[PDB]
């Protein structure tokens, strides 16, 4: 990744053994649960494009998801090139070339070129752009690997309301992470899929009830 030293200067530093093992391990234990996307973003702080490819390539299983991710990256690379085409010409001594989609993904660029763009003034953040594409791809995978549709989360007759709500929002989270959109559906299906007696309690609570008020009411 790129960090600053005591002079403030931005220098390259090797990816640490702790981070690499952490990423491989989190994938092994959590697979593509929605919560892995946060972890990837934090573990790839300051990463060069080379480092992001390293992290993804060290994953041993889930090669179907990885192949889907490659497709998504390639799709994003083409739109980058279309919206920011490369100006052709001889390179002026001490000038750097313009990054293509494939340069951002670290496939046709060298580490030195990557460092040059990231440390320029103004900086061309090829690492942050590539991370955007990868996270977009990972989001699609979490949705594909969501095991249950939210419509199939129904409170059991003997299930504590707290445990049902946990299951409800876990499924909602997998369906392309939490948003405000997930809230129009929430104020509706959470009540409709509740068990008989609790539904009566939630309906009697009225509109605009907070989770705290509903969860207290059905305790």
């Amino acid at each position: 990744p790129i960090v600053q030293n005591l002079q403030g200067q931005m220098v390259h530093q090797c990816i640490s053994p702790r981070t690499l093992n952490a990423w491989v391990k989190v994938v092994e234990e959590k697979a593509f649960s929605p919560e892995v996307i946060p972890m990837f973003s934090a573990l790839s702080c300051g990463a060069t494009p080379q480092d992001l490819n390293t992290m993804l390539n060290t994953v041993g299983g889930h090669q179907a998801a990885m192949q889907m991710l490659k497709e998504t990256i390639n799709e994003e690379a083409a739109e980058w090139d279309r919206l920011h085409p490369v100006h052709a010409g001889p390179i002026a001594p001490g000038q750097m070339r313009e990054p293509r989609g494939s340069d951002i993904a670290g496939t046709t660029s060298t580490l030195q070129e990557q460092i040059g763009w990231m440390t320029h003034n103004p900086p061309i953040p090829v690492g942050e752009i590539y991370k955007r594409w990868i996270i977009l791809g990972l989001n699609k995978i979490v949705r594909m690997y969501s095991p249950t549709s939210i419509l199939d989360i129904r409170q059991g007759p003997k299930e504590p309301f707290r445990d049902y709500v946990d299951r409800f929002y876990k499924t909602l989270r997998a369906e392309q992470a939490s948003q405000e959109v997930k809230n129009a559906a929430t104020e509706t299906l959470l009540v409709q899929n509740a068990n008989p007696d609790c539904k009566t309690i939630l309906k009697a609570l009225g509109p605009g009830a907070t989770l705290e008020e509903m969860m207290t009411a059905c305790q």
């Epitope: 007696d197 009566t200 309690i201 008020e213 207290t216 009411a217 059905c218 305790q219």
Partner: nanobody
Framework: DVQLQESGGGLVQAGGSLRLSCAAS????????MGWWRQAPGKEREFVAR???????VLADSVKGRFTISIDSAENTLALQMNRLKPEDTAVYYC????????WGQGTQVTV
């Protein structure tokens, strides 16, 4: 079992005040939530007030400036104090309490 019965409703002139009260058996602190709804002939059941244990009272906007809801654990009653009553406020008012399932009273008629 949990039993509730409202009383105090009736016909009053505009601008008057009234306190509806819903008596519950046992202790009110045992309930996890209580409140008030109303339904007038031809009008849909409308939500009036709610008090959930540990939380502040919430009131509907159509009554918010004029009604107040309070709980007296001493009298085991749920009070809704309604001042500046209007004819559009005419309806039958129901209390509910939530323990295990939801329980409702039979209602009291309010006519302005």
């Amino acid at each position: 079992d949990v039993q509730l019965q409202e009383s105090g409703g009736g016909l009053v002139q505009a601008g008057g005040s009234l306190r509806l009260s819903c008596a519950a058996s046992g202790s009110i602190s045992r309930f996890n939530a209580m409140g008030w709804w109303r339904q007038a002939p031809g009008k849909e059941r409308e939500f009036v007030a709610r008090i959930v244990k540990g939380f502040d009272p919430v009131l509907a906007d159509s009554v918010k400036g004029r009604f107040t809801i309070s709980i007296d654990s001493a009298e085991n009653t749920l009070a809704l104090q309604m001042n500046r009553l209007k004819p559009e406020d005419t309806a039958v008012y129901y209390c509910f309490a939530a323990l295990d399932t939801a329980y409702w009273g039979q209602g009291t008629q309010v006519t302005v």
